[PDB]
Symmetry: D2
C-alpha cells in the first residue's frame, strides 16, 4: 500500500489510477526512457508493472517498491 | 540559444492523435530534455515537455505540435539565454 | 472547484503537490515545474505567493480547472 | 569509459538538504538530466534523478548521494549505451 518506481525502455516510434506521474527521456535516436511513479496497492502495483515489463518491446524493465 | 516549457492537454486514449504528436516529437528529438505526463482525468492527460536549443527551432516544434489536433490548452514559455 | 495546475519558474538553486520537476538551466539557475492538483483558490494562491518571492523569476501558471 | 543514462532514486525527509545539494552539484554535476520530486507523505520526499554521462562518474556521484546519512531506499539503475 505504498509507492513504486517503474522504469522501462521502448522504441518511441513503434506505434491508470496507480499512476502519479511519468517522466520521459530520449536516451538516444530511437529509444526513450520512461519512469513511472506509482501509488496504491503494492499488489495492484507489482502486477501492472509485470504486465508492461512482460510486454514485448519493453526493454530494461525495473520496479522499485516502496511500501508505506 | 535557450530553454522552454511546452505544456498541453489531449485525450490520452487516441491512438491516431498520439501517433502524430509522437513522430512530431520524434522529428526534433534533440530539442527534448525531458517530458512529464499526468492523467488529469479518465481521458485527458497533461503533458509537460522541457526543451533546449534554438528558441527558433523550439517555437517551430512548439507551434507545430500545438496546432496538431485536439491538442488543447497548449502553451509555451520560452526562457531566453540571457538569464 | 477542483483542477490541475502547472507552476513553473526559475531561481538560483541556492498539500496540493502532485509531482515536481527540477532542471539546471546553467550552473547557477534552476528551472522548476510543479504540477498541482486541488482547489483552484488555493492553487492560484499558493502559486501567486511563490511567484512573488524575491529571487523567483519568470514565474508562470497555467490552470486546468476541468 | 562506458557511456549512458541512469536512474538514481531515493527517499528522504525534506541541513541535510544543503548536504545533498552540495553533493548534487559541487563535487560532481553536469551529469544531471532532470530530477523528479514526489511527496510520499508529510515528511518523506521520493527523488528520482535521471543522470547522463560516463557510467563511472555516475556511479561515484550515486555513491556519494546514497551514502548520505538519512537517505533511504537508494537505488541506481544504470543504462549503459546499448
Amino acid at each position: 500500500q505504498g509507492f513504486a518506481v517503474l522504469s522501462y525502455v521502448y522504441e518511441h516510434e513503434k506505434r491508470h489510477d496507480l499512476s502519479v506521474a511519468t517522466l520521459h527521456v530520449h536516451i538516444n535516436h530511437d529509444d526513450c526512457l520512461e519512469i513511472a511513479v506509482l501509488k496504491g496497492d503494492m499488489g495492484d502495483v507489482q502486477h501492472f508493472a509485470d504486465d508492461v515489463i512482460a510486454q514485448r518491446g519493453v526493454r530494461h524493465g525495473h520496479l522499485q517498491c516502496l511500501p508505506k
